[PDB]
Amino acid sequence: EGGQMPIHMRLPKLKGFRNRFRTEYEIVNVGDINRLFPQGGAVGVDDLVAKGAVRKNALVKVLGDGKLTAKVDVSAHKFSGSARAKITAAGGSATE
Amino acid sequence: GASSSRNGRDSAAQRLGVKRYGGQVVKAGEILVRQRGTKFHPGVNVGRGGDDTLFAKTAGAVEFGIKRGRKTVSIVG
Amino acid sequence: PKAKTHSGASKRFRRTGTGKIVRQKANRRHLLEHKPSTRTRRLDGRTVVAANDTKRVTSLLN
Amino acid sequence: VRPKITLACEVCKHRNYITKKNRRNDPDRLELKKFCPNCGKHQAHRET
RNA sequence: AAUAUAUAGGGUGCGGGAGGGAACGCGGGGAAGUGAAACAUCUCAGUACCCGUAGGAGGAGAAAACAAUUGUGAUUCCGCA
RNA sequence: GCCGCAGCGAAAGCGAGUCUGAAUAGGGCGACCCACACGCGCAUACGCGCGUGUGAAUAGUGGCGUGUUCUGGACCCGAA
RNA sequence: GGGAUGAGCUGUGGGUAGGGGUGAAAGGCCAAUCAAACUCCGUGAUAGCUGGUUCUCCCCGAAAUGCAUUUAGGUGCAGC
RNA sequence: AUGCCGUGGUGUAAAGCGUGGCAGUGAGACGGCGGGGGAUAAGCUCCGUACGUCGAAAGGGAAACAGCCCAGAUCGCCGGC
RNA sequence: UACUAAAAACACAGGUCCGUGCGAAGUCGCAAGACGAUGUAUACGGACUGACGCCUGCCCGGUGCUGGAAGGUUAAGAGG
RNA sequence: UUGCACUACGAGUAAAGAUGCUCGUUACGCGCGGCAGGACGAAAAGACCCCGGGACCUUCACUACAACUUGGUAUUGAUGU
RNA sequence: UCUGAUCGUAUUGGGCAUCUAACCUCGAACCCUGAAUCGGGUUUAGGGACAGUGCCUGGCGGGUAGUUUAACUGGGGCGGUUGCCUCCUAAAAUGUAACGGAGGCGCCCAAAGGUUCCCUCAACCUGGACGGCAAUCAGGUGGCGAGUGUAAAUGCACAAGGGAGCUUGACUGCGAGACUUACAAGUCAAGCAGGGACGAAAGUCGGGAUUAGUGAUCCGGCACCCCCGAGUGGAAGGGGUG
Ligand SMILES: *C(=O)[C@H](CCSC)NC=O
Ligand SMILES: [Mg+2]
Ligand SMILES: [Mg+2]
Ligand SMILES: [Mg+2]
Ligand SMILES: [Mg+2]
Ligand SMILES: [Mg+2]
Ligand SMILES: [Mg+2]
Ligand SMILES: [Mg+2]
Ligand SMILES: [Mg+2]
Ligand SMILES: [Mg+2]
Ligand SMILES: [Mg+2]
Ligand SMILES: [Mg+2]
Ligand SMILES: [Mg+2]
Ligand SMILES: [Mg+2]
Ligand SMILES: [Mg+2]
Ligand SMILES: [Mg+2]
Ligand SMILES: [Mg+2]
Ligand SMILES: [Mg+2]
Ligand SMILES: [Mg+2]
Ligand SMILES: [Mg+2]
Ligand SMILES: [Mg+2]
Ligand SMILES: [Mg+2]
Ligand SMILES: [Mg+2]
Ligand SMILES: [Mg+2]
Ligand SMILES: [Mg+2]
Ligand SMILES: [Mg+2]
Ligand SMILES: [Mg+2]
Ligand SMILES: [Mg+2]
Ligand SMILES: [Mg+2]
Ligand SMILES: [Mg+2]
Ligand SMILES: [Mg+2]
Numbered sequence A: 001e002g003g004q005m006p007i008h009m010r011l012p013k014l015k016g017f018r019n020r021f022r023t024e025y026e027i028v029n030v031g032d033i034n035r036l037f038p039q040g041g042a043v044g045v046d047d048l049v050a051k052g053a054v055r056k057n058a059l060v061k062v063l064g065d066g067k068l069t070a071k072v073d074v075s076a077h078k079f080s081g082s083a084r085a086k087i088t089a090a091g092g093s094a095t096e
Numbered sequence B: 001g002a003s004s005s006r007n008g009r010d011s012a013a014q015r016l017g018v019k020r021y022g023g024q025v026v027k028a029g030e031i032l033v034r035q036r037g038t039k040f041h042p043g044v045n046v047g048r049g050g051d052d053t054l055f056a057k058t059a060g061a062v063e064f065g066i067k068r069g070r071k072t073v074s075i076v077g
Numbered sequence C: 001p002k003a004k005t006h007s008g009a010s011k012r013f014r015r016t017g018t019g020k021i022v023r024q025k026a027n028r029r030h031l032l033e034h035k036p037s038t039r040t041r042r043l044d045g046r047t048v049v050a051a052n053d054t055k056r057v058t059s060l061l062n
Numbered sequence D: 001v002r003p004k005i006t007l008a009c010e011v012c013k014h015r016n017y018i019t020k021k022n023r024r025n026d027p028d029r030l031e032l033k034k035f036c037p038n039c040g041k042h043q044a045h046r047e048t
Numbered sequence E: 001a002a003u004a005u006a007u008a009g010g011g012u013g014c015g016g017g018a019g020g021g022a023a024c025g026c027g028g029g030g031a032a033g034u035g036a037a038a039c040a041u042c043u044c045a046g047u048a049c050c051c052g053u054a055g056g057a058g059g060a061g062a063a064a065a066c067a068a069u070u071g072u073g074a075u076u077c078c079g080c081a
Numbered sequence F: 001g002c003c004g005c006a007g008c009g010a011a012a013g014c015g016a017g018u019c020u021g022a023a024u025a026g027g028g029c030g031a032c033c034c035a036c037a038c039g040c041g042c043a044u045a046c047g048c049g050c051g052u053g054u055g056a057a058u059a060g061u062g063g064c065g066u067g068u069u070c071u072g073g074a075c076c077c078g079a080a
Numbered sequence G: 001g002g003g004a005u006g007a008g009c010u011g012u013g014g015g016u017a018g019g020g021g022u023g024a025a026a027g028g029c030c031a032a033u034c035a036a037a038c039u040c041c042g043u044g045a046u047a048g049c050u051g052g053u054u055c056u057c058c059c060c061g062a063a064a065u066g067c068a069u070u071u072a073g074g075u076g077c078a079g080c
Numbered sequence H: 001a002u003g004c005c006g007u008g009g010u011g012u013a014a015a016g017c018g019u020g021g022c023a024g025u026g027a028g029a030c031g032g033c034g035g036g037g038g039a040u041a042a043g044c045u046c047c048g049u050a051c052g053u054c055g056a057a058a059g060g061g062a063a064a065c066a067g068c069c070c071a072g073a074u075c076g077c078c079g080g081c
Numbered sequence I: 001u002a003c004u005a006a007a008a009a010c011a012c013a014g015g016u017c018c019g020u021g022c023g024a025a026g027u028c029g030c031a032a033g034a035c036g037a038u039g040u041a042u043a044c045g046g047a048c049u050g051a052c053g054c055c056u057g058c059c060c061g062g063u064g065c066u067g068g069a070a071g072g073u074u075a076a077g078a079g080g
Numbered sequence J: 001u002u003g004c005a006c007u008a009c010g011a012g013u014a015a016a017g018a019u020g021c022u023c024g025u026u027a028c029g030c031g032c033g034g035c036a037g038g039a040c041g042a043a044a045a046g047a048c049c050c051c052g053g054g055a056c057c058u059u060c061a062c063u064a065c066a067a068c069u070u071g072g073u074a075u076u077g078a079u080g081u
Numbered sequence K: 001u002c003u004g005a006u007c008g009u010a011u012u013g014g015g016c017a018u019c020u021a022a023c024c025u026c027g028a029a030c031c032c033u034g035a036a037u038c039g040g041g042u043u044u045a046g047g048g049a050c051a052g053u054g055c056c057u058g059g060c061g062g063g064u065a066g067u068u069u070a071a072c073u074g075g076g077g078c079g080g081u082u083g084c085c086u087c088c089u090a091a092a093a094u095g096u097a098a099c100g101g102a103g104g105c106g107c108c109c110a111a112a113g114g115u116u117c118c119c120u121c122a123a124c125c126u127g128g129a130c131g132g133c134a135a136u137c138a139g140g141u142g143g144c145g146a147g148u149g150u151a152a153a154u155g156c157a158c159a160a161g162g163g164a165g166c167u168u169g170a171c172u173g174c175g176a177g178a179c180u181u182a183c184a185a186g187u188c189a190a191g192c193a194g195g196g197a198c199g200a201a202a203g204u205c206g207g208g209a210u211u212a213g214u215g216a217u218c219c220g221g222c223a224c225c226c227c228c229g230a231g232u233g234g235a236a237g238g239g240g241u242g
């Protein structure tokens, strides 16, 4: 910058650390379940990969954005708190 | 040759003065007059400030006036 | 070859969900006794990188 | 001659405040009531 | 032999080495200009150069290995990461 | 394998939210349609909330052009 | 014009090598080159400096200011 | 007095603003008006000026004459003001 | 001072100081080895002065050189 | 050596010292020999000066390093006090 | 069981002396050796756990090496200057240059902060033991010529100037909306909540009449929170907040 202290040395570093052991989830919303499976039934991790909702080889996680109106029965990892509500209130279940 | 060893320095100009003029519509919180001392005094819906900074307390219109010799800044909501 | 990113700028800038670039604020690490709490609260948190710096900062992050 | 002194709570011992006194006009440790955010109320505060 | 045991040395007889080669391998030694808009840490770069030594390739290689509760099962090379 | 598919946070984490906070305070960042038919307690007719849409207006990614750019001698010539 | 039996001149053969030689000492001399020789390589050394940069038309069209600068003939950002 | 800020009218295509791509420039010069430095010298030097021209502006005038006065060259004509 | 300076510059004989007891000090080499020297303090190396004549005064605070070691401070090792 | 060429002078003017521009004045075309006022003549990318870079030299500038030197420890044993 | 002394046992270390066998000798003789001032071996004469050398460690070290040694500037050098605050220049908004004209700052105050209430000054005149131009007193007159921790400007007599009582807001969690601005910075802020001070209440208080009294990042230190913890449980180390 011509000789003065540049923008990448005037400013402080962003605080914190990166977690080395951070587990990451691939996210599916329960409103996407209603559009992808409008008949209900069993929904596994393999059934979400083929439907394009989620990536391969990764831990999935159901979140509760949208409106679930079908009677699905979904197995996944780590359900959300508002996603366990909408699945049972539509008539189904959610297991690990 | 000699030198001006005793002179040559100054502070920065502080950008003081009236910032919103008369009849001009302002928002709540807008600075009206920036000054040293009270060259202007607060009026209705105007507060002074920590370094005599005469801001707005209420949205309205700026109007200047006189109140027993002193000149004041007021807001008409 | 392959473009190396800038190590010192990636420790100072990051991106939000929409693509804004945020930074932290200076005058906060030490000498904090004569600074009132109206000033350290002003210098707290993050702000968006200003429009006149966003072209050079985006190229340091890429 | 005007050192930076720190004030600690007399209950939880947290060093909540920093200020300045005169080392000669006030040669012993200050005592002030200040707000302690841990206790959530006003406590007494000496120096350290 | 000196000097006794002997040894150094000497005699005799068979073998082998020595030098050259364009690049590639392994082992060792090792810069500077340059970059840092100065400069010493740092970079350049283990590069250039040098020394020893191969082979048709060489080096590595058969877990005192990883991994993390599941497991994989010598090395080398390539693509990802 | 890479990029798109959810973000927020130092992180644990939680997730259309989330961090800070005592806060059901405010603020940051991120999602979020009324242009609209019926209607629901309706509001001067207005539009807040949800179904069926009236069937709203968006999206990425791989090629190949071109401009700038990074690393290389990097437009070319020139020292002591 | 100086020396011209001397610390003389000369022939032949030899020795000392580059941060080194040699010097009755001038930084002299070391192959017409010396305040660190020559040659090849690193190498296309580097130069905020000077120069050069090759056919056409159409449309628009500056700046020589501010701020910061080991900065002032350079550059970053703003202005245009 | 001007200038500056706000607002209501009226006027005026190539104004203004936001966000991207690519710039160049950051040595200015003289003239008018206001001021500093200098001796109220300088073709001096440093600032101000919705001032001007040159820079980057040909044509007419000032004998000649970047910066002054008039006027802004799409091309052609042996027309006119 | 080959090639713009021949001098008052350098050298010199004489002077003084300092080092050196012998594969000496000093120098050349990583070392071995060499030179000094087939020499031995009347010798050899360094520094300064420069035939000769008459002379060479005062200062040991600064800074070096030589000798000392009572006190202060101080490394690795030991101690833990 | 060389951008050209049927290359005058005076007073001016202009990047402020004009063969080339303005206004004048003077001069038939072309050779030969001489002189050295101008062509800011030729030659040498000014040695002076300043700015940027370099080199060598200096020292109580900075950081290193050879040399020289101190102690511990290994090579390294035995016995008295 | 203490200080001091003495003694024993065991362990460790320093001096001092002697020894010879490591090692050392460019001291001598003999052999390899025919020709050898080299070398090696053998014996002798000396020296000797010293020296020399390896590793580690301190000193000294222009002997050598790589380098740095600022800019501004009416050429450069020399002198002066460099950041912040106030005034004039500055042309009645803001802003504006010069080695133009004048000054200050790198602090100070536990009250010189907060709040509640009360007061009015300097100068002049008259009278008065010491006592004077001027100390303290009394009466007049006096609208600010005094004062303000500290330069100057803008302010302040309604007081922001003088006195007094209680106090710690010289708070924590925040902050709509502005000023200034290339950027980094700087500055102001109504109001909301917690827990407080003063006040009967209204209210006011996030240091000081206001503007100087300061220093980015990196790298660390300390205190707390208990976020991560390289198989696991801890720890080391890191992270957040002050
Ligand atoms: C001055 O030192 C002198 C001036 C030259 S005059 C053009 N230069 C000598 O070398
Ligand atoms: Mg700087
Ligand atoms: Mg000012
Ligand atoms: Mg304040
Ligand atoms: Mg901190
Ligand atoms: Mg604080
Ligand atoms: Mg006190
Ligand atoms: Mg025998
Ligand atoms: Mg061979
Ligand atoms: Mg280098
Ligand atoms: Mg460099
Ligand atoms: Mg450079
Ligand atoms: Mg093999
Ligand atoms: Mg994230
Ligand atoms: Mg929110
Ligand atoms: Mg497409
Ligand atoms: Mg003669
Ligand atoms: Mg002769
Ligand atoms: Mg003669
Ligand atoms: Mg030499
Ligand atoms: Mg000389
Ligand atoms: Mg020569
Ligand atoms: Mg050299
Ligand atoms: Mg190279
Ligand atoms: Mg080049
Ligand atoms: Mg145009
Ligand atoms: Mg410039
Ligand atoms: Mg630019
Ligand atoms: Mg643009
Ligand atoms: Mg300029
Ligand atoms: Mg230029």
Ligand SMILES: [Mg+2]
Pocket: none
């Ligand atoms: Mg100018």
Ligand SMILES: [Mg+2]
Pocket: none
């Ligand atoms: Mg003028």
Ligand SMILES: [Mg+2]
Pocket: none
């Ligand atoms: Mg001028």
Ligand SMILES: [Mg+2]
Pocket: none
């Ligand atoms: Mg002008």
Ligand SMILES: [Mg+2]
Pocket: none
């Ligand atoms: Mg013209």
Ligand SMILES: [Mg+2]
Pocket: none
């Ligand atoms: Mg124009």
Ligand SMILES: [Mg+2]
Pocket: none
């Ligand atoms: Mg003209």
Ligand SMILES: [Mg+2]
Pocket: none
């Ligand atoms: Mg004309």
Ligand SMILES: [Mg+2]
Pocket: H081
């Ligand atoms: Mg006519």
Ligand SMILES: [Mg+2]
Pocket: I001
């Ligand atoms: Mg000569």
Ligand SMILES: [Mg+2]
Pocket: none
């Ligand atoms: Mg001569």
Ligand SMILES: [Mg+2]
Pocket: none
């Ligand atoms: Mg010797």
Ligand SMILES: [Mg+2]
Pocket: none
């Ligand atoms: Mg002697």
Ligand SMILES: [Mg+2]
Pocket: I017, I047, I048
């Ligand atoms: Mg001497």
Ligand SMILES: [Mg+2]
Pocket: none
């Ligand atoms: Mg002499």
Ligand SMILES: [Mg+2]
Pocket: none
């Ligand atoms: Mg002599």
